[PDB]
Amino acid sequence: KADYIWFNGEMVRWEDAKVHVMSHALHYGTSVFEGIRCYDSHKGPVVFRHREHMQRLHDSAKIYRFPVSQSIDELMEACRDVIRKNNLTSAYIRPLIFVGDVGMGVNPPAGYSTDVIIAAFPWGAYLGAEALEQGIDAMVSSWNRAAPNTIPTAAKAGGNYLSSLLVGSEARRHGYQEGIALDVNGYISEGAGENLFEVKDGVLFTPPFTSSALPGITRDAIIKLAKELGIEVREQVLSRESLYLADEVFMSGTAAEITPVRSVDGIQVGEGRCGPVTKRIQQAFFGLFTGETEDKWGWLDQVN
Amino acid sequence: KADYIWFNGEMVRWEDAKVHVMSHALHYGTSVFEGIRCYDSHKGPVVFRHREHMQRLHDSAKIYRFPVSQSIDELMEACRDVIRKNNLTSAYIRPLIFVGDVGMGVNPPAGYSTDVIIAAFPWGAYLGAEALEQGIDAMVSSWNRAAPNTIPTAAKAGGNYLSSLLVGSEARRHGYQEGIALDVNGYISEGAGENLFEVKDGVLFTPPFTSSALPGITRDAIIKLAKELGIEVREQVLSRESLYLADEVFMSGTAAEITPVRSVDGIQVGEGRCGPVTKRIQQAFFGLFTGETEDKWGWLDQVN
Amino acid sequence: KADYIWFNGEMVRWEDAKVHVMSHALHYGTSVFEGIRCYDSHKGPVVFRHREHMQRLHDSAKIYRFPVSQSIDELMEACRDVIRKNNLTSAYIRPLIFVGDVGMGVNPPAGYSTDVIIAAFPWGAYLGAEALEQGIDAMVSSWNRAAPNTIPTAAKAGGNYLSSLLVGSEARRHGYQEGIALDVNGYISEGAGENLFEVKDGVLFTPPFTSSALPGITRDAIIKLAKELGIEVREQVLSRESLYLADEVFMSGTAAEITPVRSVDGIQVGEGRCGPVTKRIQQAFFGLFTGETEDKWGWLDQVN
Amino acid sequence: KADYIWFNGEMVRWEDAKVHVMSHALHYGTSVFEGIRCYDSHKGPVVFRHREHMQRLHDSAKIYRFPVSQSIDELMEACRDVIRKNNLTSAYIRPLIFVGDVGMGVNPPAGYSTDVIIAAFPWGAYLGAEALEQGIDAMVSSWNRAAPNTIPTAAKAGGNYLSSLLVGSEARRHGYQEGIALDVNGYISEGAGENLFEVKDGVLFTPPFTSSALPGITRDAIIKLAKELGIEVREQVLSRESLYLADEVFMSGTAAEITPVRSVDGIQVGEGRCGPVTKRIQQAFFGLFTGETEDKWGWLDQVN
Amino acid sequence: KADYIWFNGEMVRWEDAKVHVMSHALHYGTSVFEGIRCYDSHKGPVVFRHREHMQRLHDSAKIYRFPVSQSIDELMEACRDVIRKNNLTSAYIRPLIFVGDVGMGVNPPAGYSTDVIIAAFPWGAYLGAEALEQGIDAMVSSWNRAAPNTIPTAAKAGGNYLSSLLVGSEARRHGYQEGIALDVNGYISEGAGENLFEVKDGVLFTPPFTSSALPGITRDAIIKLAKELGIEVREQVLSRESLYLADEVFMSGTAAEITPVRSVDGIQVGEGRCGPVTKRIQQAFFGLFTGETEDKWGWLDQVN
Amino acid sequence: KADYIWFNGEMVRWEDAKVHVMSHALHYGTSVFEGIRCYDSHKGPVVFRHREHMQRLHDSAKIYRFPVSQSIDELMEACRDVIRKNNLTSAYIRPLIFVGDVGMGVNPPAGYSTDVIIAAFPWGAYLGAEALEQGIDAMVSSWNRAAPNTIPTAAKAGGNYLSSLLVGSEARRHGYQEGIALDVNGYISEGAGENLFEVKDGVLFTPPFTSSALPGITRDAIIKLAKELGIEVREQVLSRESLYLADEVFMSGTAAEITPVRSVDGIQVGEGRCGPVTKRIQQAFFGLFTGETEDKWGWLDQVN
Ligand SMILES: *Cc1c(COP(=O)(O)O)cnc(C)c1O
Ligand SMILES: *Cc1c(COP(=O)(O)O)cnc(C)c1O
Ligand SMILES: *Cc1c(COP(=O)(O)O)cnc(C)c1O
Ligand SMILES: *Cc1c(COP(=O)(O)O)cnc(C)c1O
Ligand SMILES: *Cc1c(COP(=O)(O)O)cnc(C)c1O
């Protein structure tokens, strides 16, 4: 929570940011959202890969044909404006584009407009306060990720998350920190809300998007970072059991950043701590906010 | 719009039924809903298969482990109460149970509670003012229905409607009234928001739930009415091309009631009009609200 | 061979029934056909389930939207005319609707018409001289039947037969009389060019159309004969290994009639000879052309 | 049309190139063919990747075990002879190997030979007059490409085209220029009769053959031209929604050459016009027949 | 454990029943086995559905072409002989047919013989001492059952059990009594070593064998018993979530007999105790050994 | 047969290496094994990729959670010790870890231990005395390889060989030397007990592990040797028909080493003999044991 929320171009106090219970999205999962982090850095408060996230917000909307009135630059300014208007230097930002109060049929009435919200607020490590340093214990879920050509997994939409709820809630109920879902083919897809990476013999592996995995922006950053670090990367389908044979394993996400996975289904991964390659990647990722890692791609948007 | 809406145990005026923009369901499709019709009949206003719908509402929630505080009878009284107060004699009732303002993680905090809304309002034939009489032109969608064990299609959840949007809007954009979706195996599943029935040589056919089709209450009713009429019924998987060979075809649902399908993909069905068996079923169905069809099951819940 | 072939309404000498090499179907498999048998019965030469076959010819053409100018009755009269013109009392008839000389694009030009042929000629036991009496040895093919929603297996089309060729030729190359193909799910579909039945504990079994099996007219007749004989019938998916556990197994088809399968993949079926249930259906079937079996369905169309 | 057609070695007047209506391929889709273009270049009339096409003709026939008596060199010489005999300097050539008048069983009799035809004639832009310059509007089909191990999609066979007909005619019926088919896994396969390419972030993408896509010779040429142009190429599975996120999309084929796709399912691709990368490949491709692009692969076969 | 084990026709003392470590089955899973119970009854010690089990032993062997020298009657006598020779009146019998010391290639040398063992010994309720009366808590496994046409699930072979080990061990590790596996389609298959039954609205449901479920003999007994009890039975595919909506649920097996399942994945089934319909079936099953249930099928083989 | 066998830490004479008939693995396929060859080389007897195999042996056990007491080096010394004692200079070593006499439930009792055996003995070319030189005739099986997430194909377990038996014995019964299996998707997986390689236009191809193929150690070696030879290698999914178009094809394995495949399904590959690239690879492979090929990886473990 924070003091204000950007709501359709106007800064509204948090408590007054409300919508009608008959809003389309509450009944039909009709919304697309983003996860963005603003970090403290040597350059001051910076939003990580800001433009890439707003571009994806638009892409998700385009896929479902949800009309978006704000341009990417407007959404970005709006985002920076809510970060300052709330006096935050570090935070998690949640943009949300949803079909609002427009009538009950699943097909929105012609000419409708979508509602847009953007809330920023501090948010701890997604998988725990000990996650980033100690790693977590994962569980392969009994629920599979959405099949191709059903609900586009390339789009980050609200409705998709019933699946992430089933996969993630199951792991927790069974005492694990996160759940790893397989696609309808029996191959590794990703975690409930984070992409999956494996390390074997010094090479980094990760499932392609066609494994029903969302095109993670953190995932993309890690691949390019790894290439810079001289680490070979292979985007390929991964068997379920490969999780038990990898030297290292970890998850990526805007919220979960880079979280080592010390075990899967009770089976220890490597030494049971953060692996050497994971450490290198992790250090290179954060060194970006210390300036130790050169921002060669222009991934740090300054809030001002 | 109506005048009041049942919101968490109390009837609030329509304009005040609002929830926070950070309500879980707006971001994660975490809601389950129902569709119910109140018919003005020879016995005055009656809710059709009222209890069955509230039970299903409970089952959907149970599947996702969404905590529900109200019992079926409680919900039933609330529904009935909503119709009276708004002074409706015929209407569409939309009960809705969703995870509200509980924080931003997809996994809700332990001990949370859901918000429950029940709105009622008049709503015309779902597929057109001519639909029920002249029948509609349907299109087979290029989008498939959710695969087994990904999202439970036996549950009527809000999140899953992203799929119905893709299926239904496509047919509509191409000039049809509704889209028919195949499951991931290539067999007929159902319409975007209606179950699919076919008639050939006097026998009634419809896919089983395992064809990724919702276990519709209108569908179950039709199967029963058909049997009472001596019409043989076969619940079995159906081929996509079977839509072109069927003597008759129609859709079913609370909103769409019993809508004949006069053409599929531009291929006329039968004589391009409502078929004889669809006719009997339909007359039998609507005969319930005139007394011509004896309510031998107890499907009419008097509003009072 | 025979003397005349009905061609677009005309009785053409067999040697003059030719088409340009640039005819569409020779390049794109764009044709639909039927197999029909005229038997020399107690009622004289009669065409078996004549209307049913011509109706299917139309259905197959309809699925592909091939324009057909002859009505089912026109087709039937032409068929009888062909038989008499060649003075045949028993024969195999091959009606064939195909896209002809209309230009090289796969999509035919608007307003085009199809060419129609009906050739009648004597044709013996499809699966061999001993087949009907002693049964054949079948092999499960390494090639699978077409998947649902690719090339509609419910339509009897020319292009379909590339599959039948692969399945059948393989079995024959390995020394068997016919090949049994499995669908893409690994379940029994049917023989390369005939439906497959199994007999277990006095109950008759056969796969539904959704197992990528063509809705055989002979298959349909068997099912009806079986029920008149007091034999329970079950149309359900069948496992590949069920072929090794069945008491009896046989194939059906217009050309193949009812052929007993004494062995599958070298494993013996029952006594390795025609089974008792098979025997009954067979006698019942052929008894239709001697009068021993009453034509309660009106399956014998008098040629005259 | 043209004056002569090479037929089993002889130069036959177009009007005399006929086959019996009882020819095997007219009933069983038993034929394999090729699309080849002769261009009027700076070197005179040349057949593009002539040997490659005839080799594929043989491969396709080999897969089905169709006996072929002409060698690749005999076929090529016949093709050049056909072109010259019709005094053509630019044309589309259609070689066709088919099972002819050999009896009605699907399995041809032992010792049979195939009939071979090579017809040459002028043929314009496969996808329209503006297609090459302005791009077309594509639609994702509701029909899927043949599954692996059913009908080998690597073989260019006549029977295959029933699928291409369904896919293409649907798009055309809905007002689009071409249809894009997905495989049975829900991933992009290709266009009804052309391979599909995507351009994203300056990188060229196209599905592998295992996505049920025919190994296009034009596709292969593009990949080679791309690498000479310094364009990175990635043959990988592509999601259906990737079509909406790609910077550019285009189709390839002998008939279709290189046709830009400006929109998919009504959604605009990039600027809605030919993309920059597409532009380069296109110029590079056509520059082969003007000399601007060096034939480093020996793709221009002199007709003489 | 007991005093003697029937080993290739000779009663050997338990401890001396050994085989060479190079026995085929230890390296290739090449064995087929059965589970049979002998009960105390009013008729004295009786083996339940004795002939049916030995017939299946033979069927399993036939499927893998393992030569079996003993006839069914010999195996039965041998079985009764080990029950008496060990002085048991109630017990679990384990027949085992395995490829022995014949060399290391997976394909056994031509002319080989299989080894056969039959051990009887008391064995408590498979799923616990409180299982049959209180019911158990089940868990849907993250491991799926074998796909059709890979390893025939209709055959009860040793090699198959690696799967039952993965499914069952997982449920236990997570604190459950048994695991329920879904097939590769996402539908209910069965428990790790027991068939699955569901009860909804007084009707009994169970997956067909094509759901990759073994043709349980206990399962078969229950179906016939239910029919006798007037209970409608439907053999059909069941969705994963149906487990959460059934009134009752239970497992069947020779070892587990009839075990109520009070919960699945933490979700209570019905009232959480043995359900009414399950009780009826259970009582009817055991009444067979008290003589209260008439043995109308001849399921009780007397040991003597 | 040899003279001694390493059995649980001590070398016992061949005739005494026996386990109880009630050993878990005999009834449940619960064992994991390896295949290793000892070559007499320019450096005397050397075990090929000794450590890699013992590691894999450990990984397979870890996948099934089979407790292993010995370390890799321990196992390695035991292997080496087995070769010396038996006085072999070249041989096939079969390590075997299995669940022994621990009770009759599929789930072993907590705290159990596995039995470990390591046998060595001379073994000729796996597919014939002419195999490696003349190549073999292969057949595509009608049985498919285990699907992902059913049985982990990344583990070399005994139970899974029921599948290799079905695949391999079929080809053998039809007169071929080995069978090639497709996965459940219809793509090439591998041979019954060998990985499958294809050569086309100088490039080496082989399916990835995700094609249900074991991650062979000979396969990995070949990929490395090929690269050292400048041969491009592509690990990708391969179509079934690609077997007929490849210039060269061969199998790989510890037992089969590098066996050329001269024909598939009766269709000759290349010139019907070992192909040029297979030749180079092979010469490179066997060159390791003469010193001609520099062991640049450390694949030869001296027996001493
Ligand atoms: C948001 C999300 C991720 C992480 O992607 P980032 O762009 O790196 O935040 C991963 N998986 C799913 C399903 C997601 O919704
Ligand atoms: C609500 C719904 C139906 C219709 O079910 P009824 O219970 O008859 O209203 C059909 N299909 C889907 C996908 C639905 O959501
Ligand atoms: C024609 C055909 C049959 C047989 O059907 P009938 O109507 O009985 O002749 C069976 N299978 C296939 C694939 C066929 O084409
Ligand atoms: C012929 C064909 C193509 C195009 O291949 P080219 O060799 O480039 O002509 C593409 N797809 C299909 C289905 C085809 O038959
Ligand atoms: C043995 C077994 C059963 C139970 O079958 P019964 O004949 O009733 O003993 C169920 N599932 C599997 C996988 C089995 O092996």
Ligand SMILES: *Cc1c(COP(=O)(O)O)cnc(C)c1O
């Ligand atoms: C053992 C085996 C191989 C060969 O692997 P290598 O490590 O090279 O010996 C190939 N396929 C299967 C199924 C195997 O079991």
Ligand SMILES: O=C(O)CCCC(=O)O
């Ligand atoms: O990582 C993110 O930014 C979004 C996923 C986390 C969640 O909202 O559950």
Ligand SMILES: O=C(O)CCCC(=O)O
């Ligand atoms: O709101 C919709 O679009 C679906 C309504 C479904 C029903 O209640 O029948």
Ligand SMILES: O=C(O)CCCC(=O)O
């Ligand atoms: O022509 C064939 O090869 C099969 C025809 C099938 C039939 O007519 O029954």
Ligand SMILES: O=C(O)CCCC(=O)O
């Ligand atoms: O004939 C067609 O319709 C397509 C031919 C494809 C080609 O030759 O490129």
Ligand SMILES: O=C(O)CCCC(=O)O
């Ligand atoms: O029920 C049976 O008879 C066999 C399965 C139990 C087991 O051996 O694990």
Ligand SMILES: O=C(O)CCCC(=O)O
């Ligand atoms: O024993 C077999 O039949 C397989 C041997 C596999 C290998 O070690 O290469």
